[PDB]
């Protein structure tokens, strides 16, 4: 009776942590090999079966201020609104969960360093769609924009998330209703025919397979806006957790990881090129990446690849690399850490950020290797 029979096929080289629903990340060897992650490798994160969508009978629902409903077809979304492109990294709340479970087991998909990818998205500006539906530039008080997807659970409830009205209306926030990804139409796994893209914020809020946009006095009433995607003290456990006591994750903290070489690898002597990525929420730029060969006692500054984005609008990761000298038969512990435009930094160790749900894993990334003789 398989609810997943309809799912699309995937690239055979992904690291799959869950088949049903499908949740996988690119192999770390390939993760930072390009600045734009090819579509078929882009990390994929699904809560439910992937909806089968028939393009022409597709209608996106958008309720105007007055409770009247406007309803947009896919053709009309492409032609009513000037297409805008935005290059943005999506990062799973629980990227790097693995390292947290090493300290104490947590419940969640066991992502490694790869629950993150970058793509050039293209489509309508949400701000434009809303203005078109009749909304003003500014509402009085705290308002939220709610998205529902087409995928729902056994019992009817759709996946949903929300963002602050302000962020939705802002030209600089670049919030897209994308129908293109890396120059082609949105793949099924990635939200075909339409998804929201919220630059600078946790991946959880980029609703895929979009069916509705509502404006409201409150956050998305949904399970995943309300009872998931929050960070707690390392002391909080499954009996003590109170979801009303922490804000829903929106922006993410500064983050980086070593993608080459891999743990346990033996590398040749002379010169070693260490490569990785770094990124920060909030559209805040990565301004420096320090790398260590000795477990974080001494550091050197890595080189940042990529082109500078406007101030406040660094939605894309920075890729870094650092070529250094390595001795016959030494042991290296390779550490990296990133600093952003607000000078936020990454913490030394993992225990003090541990949280029962395994999200927000951004302590320094350590990689043990040896040098052959």
* 166, interface contact from ligand MTE, a copy of itself, ligand MOM, none, CB < 5-8 Å by kind: a copy of itself
Q: Contact at 8 Å (CB) between 149 and 53?
A: no
Cα separation, 335 vs 292, whole angstroms: 5
Measured from the CB atom, is 270 or 347 closer to a copy of itself?
Answer: 347
Q: Please report whether residue 282 would count as binding a copy of itself according to CB under 8 A.
A: yes
Q: Please report whether residue 163 would count as binding ligand MOM according to CB under 6 A.
A: no
* Binding segment toward ligand MOM, per CB under 6 A, in 76-84, 201-209, 302-310, 342-350: 201-209
Q: Please report whether residue 151 would count as binding ligand MTE according to CB under 6 A.
A: yes
Beta-sheet pairing, 69-73 with 84-91: unpaired
Q: Please report whether residue 341 would count as binding a copy of itself according to CB under 8 A.
A: yes
**x/- track of binding to ligand MOM for residues 92-131 (CB under 6 A):** xxx--------------------x----------------
Can you tell me which of 50, 74, 198, 254 binds a copy of itself, judged by CB under 8 A?
254
- Which has the closest alpha carbon to 246: 230, 234, 235? 230
- Which has the closest alpha carbon to 280: 248, 312, 252, 310? 252
Q: Contact at 8 Å (CB) between 356 and 236?
A: yes
Tokens found for residue 290: 């320090």
Q: Please report whether residue 144 would count as binding ligand MTE according to CB under 6 A.
A: no
Q: Please report whether residue 178 would count as binding ligand MTE according to CB under 6 A.
A: no
Tokens found for residue 135: 């909304």
Q: Please report whether residue 282 would count as binding ligand MOM according to CB under 6 A.
A: no
Alpha helix (H) residue ranges in 134-239: 165-169, 223-226
* 300, interface contact from a copy of itself, ligand MTE, ligand MOM, none, CB < 5-8 Å by kind: a copy of itself
Q: C-alpha dihedral over 230, 220, 123, 191, to 10 degrees? A: 70
Sheet harboring 144-152: ordered strands across? 69-73, 59-63, 210-216, 144-152, 158-164
Cα separation, 144 vs 146, whole angstroms: 6
Cα separation, 8 vs 186, whole angstroms: 13
Site for ligand MOM in 38-77 (CB under 6 A): 45
Q: Please report whether residue 47 would count as binding ligand MTE according to CB under 6 A.
A: yes
- Which has the closest alpha carbon to 315: 362, 283, 271, 274? 283
Rule CB under 8 A: which residues touch a copy of itself?
A: 142, 164, 166, 231, 233-236, 246-247, 249-254, 281-282, 285, 287-288, 290, 296-301, 310-312, 337, 339, 341-349, 351-353, 360, 362
Rule CB under 6 A: which residues touch ligand MTE?
A: 42-48, 90, 92, 149, 151, 159, 190, 203-204, 206-209
Rule CB under 6 A: which residues touch ligand MOM?
A: 45, 92-94, 115, 202-204
């Amino acid at each position: 009776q398989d609810p997943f029979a309809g799912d699309p096929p995937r690239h055979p080289g992904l690291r799959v942590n869950s088949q049903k629903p499908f949740n996988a990340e690119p192999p770390a060897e390939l993760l930072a090999e390009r600045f734009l992650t090819p579509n078929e490798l882009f990390f994929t994160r699904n809560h439910l079966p992937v909806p089968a969508v028939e393009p022409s009978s597709y209608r996106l629902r958008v309720d105007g201020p007055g409770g009247g409903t406007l309803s947009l077809s896919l053709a009309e979304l492409r032609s009513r609104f000037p297409k805008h492109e935005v290059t943005a990294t999506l990062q799973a709340a629980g990227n790097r969960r693995s390292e947290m479970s090493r300290v104490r087991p947590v419940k969640g998909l066991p992502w490694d360093i790869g629950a993150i990818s970058t793509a050039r998205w293209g489509g309508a500006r949400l701000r434009d769609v809303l203005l078109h539906a009749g909304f003003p530039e500014e509402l009085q008080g705290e308002w939220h924009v709610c998205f529902e997807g087409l995928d729902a659970d056994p019992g009817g409830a759709p996946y949903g998330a929300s963002i602050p009205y302000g962020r939705a209306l802002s030209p600089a926030a670049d919030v897209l209703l994308a129908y293109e990804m890396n120059g082609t139409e949105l793949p099924r796994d990635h939200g075909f025919p339409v998804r929201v893209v919220v630059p600078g914020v946790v991946g959880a809020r980029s609703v895929k397979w979009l069916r509705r946009v509502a404006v409201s006095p409150d956050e998305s009433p949904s399970h995943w806006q309300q009872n998931d995607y929050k960070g707690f003290s390392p002391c909080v456990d499954w009996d003590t957790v109170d979801y009303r006591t922490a804000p829903a994750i929106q922006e993410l903290p500064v983050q980086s990881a070593v993608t080459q070489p891999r743990p346990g690898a033996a590398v040749p002597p002379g010169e070693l090129t260490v490569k990785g990525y770094a990124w920060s929420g909030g559209g805040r730029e990565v301004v420096r990446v320090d790398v260590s060969l000795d477990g974080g006692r001494t550091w050197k500054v890595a080189r940042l690849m990529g082109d500078k984005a406007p101030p406040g609008r660094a939605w894309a990761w920075a890729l870094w690399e650092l070529t250094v000298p390595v001795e016959a038969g030494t042991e290296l512990e390779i550490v990296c850490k990133a600093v952003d435009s607000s000078y936020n930094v990454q913490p030394d160790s993992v225990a003090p950020i541990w949280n029962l749900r395994g999200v927000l894993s951004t302590a320094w990334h350590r990689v043990r290797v040896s040098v052959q003789d």
